Paper text:
To further test this finding, we purified a hexa-histidyl-tagged [name] domain (residues 1–185, [name]-[name]-His6) and tested the binding of different cOAs using isothermal titration calorimetry (ITC). We found that [name]-[name]-His6 binds to both cA6 and [name] with a kD of 30 and 700 nM, respectively. We also co-crystallized cA6 and [name] with [name]-[name]-His6 and solved the crystal structures at 1.8 and 2.4 Å resolution, respectively. Although both cOA ligands were fully accommodated in the electropositive pocket of apo [name]-[name]-His6, they affected differently the angle between the two C-terminal legs of the [name] monomers. While cA6 binding produced a minor change (from 58° in the apo structure to 55°), [name] binding opened this angle to 76°, most likely a consequence of the deep burial of [name] within the pocket. The Watson-Crick edges of several adenosines of bound cA6 and [name] form intermolecular hydrogen bonds group of charged residues within the pocket, including K104, that account for the specificity of cOA recognition. Superposition of the structure of this domain within the hexamer with that of the [name]-bound [name]-[name]-His6 showed good structural correlation (root-mean-square deviation [RMSD] 2.8 Å), with a 3 Å upward shift of the ligand and a decrease in the angle between the C-terminal legs (57°) in the cryo-EM structure. We believe this shift could be due to either the truncation of the full-length [name] protein in the case of the crystal structure, crystal-packing forces, or some combination of these factors.
In order to identify novel [name] effectors, we used Foldseek18 to search for proteins with structural homology to [name] domain of the Cam1 effector. This method rendered a 600-residue protein containing an N-terminal [name] domain followed by a linker region and a C-terminal adenosine deaminase (ADA) domain, with accession number HAJ98955.1 from an unknown Bacteriodales bacterium (hereafter named [name]-associated deaminase, [name]-associated adenosine deaminase 1 [[name]]), for which homologs were already identified in a previous bioinformatic screen. [name] is located immediately downstream the cas10-csm genes of a type III-A [name] locus. Further analysis of [name] homologs showed that over 70% associate in genomes containing type III systems (mostly belonging to the A and B subtypes) and exist within many unique phyla of bacteria. These data suggest that [name] is a widespread effector in type III [name]-Cas systems. Altogether, these data demonstrate that [name] deaminates ATP molecules to [name] through the formation of an hexameric complex that requires a Mg+2 or Mn+2 cofactor and an activating [name] or cA6 ligand. While the triggering of a growth arrest in the host is a common strategy of all [name] effectors, we believe that [name] introduces a new mode of defense for [name]-Cas systems that couples nucleotide deamination activity to a sequence-specific, RNA-guided adaptive immune response.
Author numbering:
A (entry chain A), B (entry chain B): 2 to 165
The structure:
RNA sequence: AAAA
């Protein structure tokens, strides 16, 4: 199974855009984000539940709305890394999109990909930042969505073993 | 010399906020950004023109307006790391603010700090994102500007010698 | 998705 791992922020369209980084799409899409109300899950649940062959989940860093100090970041990172281990497939490395969330959320996800492994680690950028699924598809058909591979990450099998 | 190194984006207020990460201020602030016309330095230059004793410079990634693909990122990263070596002080590590620019710009800056060294690597966060100098001074008074330390970076003395 |  191809599995996509993503952080999310306010812009609802980055995870859907990231879902199109690969022609086949993805079998599983998993999101990690804060408890902030600046993240609205409804658009994500609507779109991904309407796709037939896709397992979708949103995991919140429970009790944390914002990363405002060092303890917040540490708590977020601990929850993200355990989440990464839980959601990644058993016989393959996941795909990882970094574009969602705040910079430090994204950098923590990059570090996780480096330690545990990622088949692909990528940014998605949009010329005109589509606001909804219809504009996303319009942007895709016009070649206005760009995917930037930051690099394959082998990770350490000695760390992937720890998921048990 | 306390020196601040910063990526810059379209929110012109992150660098003047970062200037206040340390009570004694910075003797030098150096900014690196893209060559896109969507970069308006005016409010940035206003702030440091009212601190004429601070050494201040803006360096552009000549020819690169955006990071749209892997070659764009790689060219950005090579100039950024050259500039980091050029700007960092001779006998102590610089301070590094990560909050400006797009995520990939910021990740490349953090990698440079990891490699060449940084006394401090921090994000600057604002409760309500000032848009102008007066709003920022108000937010600083009221403690609405937050600073997150991501970590001291010793770097490698063997790489620092290469500024020769 | 250039302070989410």
């Amino acid at each position: 199974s191809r599995v996509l791992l993503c952080s999310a922020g306010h812009s609802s369209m980055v995870v859907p855009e990231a879902f199109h980084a690969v022609p086949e799409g993805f079998e599983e899409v998993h999101v990690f984000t804060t408890d902030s109300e600046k993240f609205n899950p409804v658009v994500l649940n609507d779109f991904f539940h309407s796709l037939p062959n896709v397992r979708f989940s949103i995991t919140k860093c429970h009790g944390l709305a914002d990363i405002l100090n060092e303890r917040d970041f540490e708590f977020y990172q601990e929850m993200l890394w355990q989440w990464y281990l839980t959601k990644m497939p058993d016989n393959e490395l996941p795909y990882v999109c970094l574009s969602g969330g705040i910079k430090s959320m994204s950098a923590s996800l990059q570090k996780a990909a480096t330690l545990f492994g990622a088949q692909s680690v990528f940014h998605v950028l949009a010329d005109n930042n589509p606001r909804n699924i219809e504009e996303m598809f319009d942007a895709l058909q016009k070649g206005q969505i760009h995917f930037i591979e930051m690099g394959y990450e082998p990770g350490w099998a000695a760390l992937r073993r720890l998921k048990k």
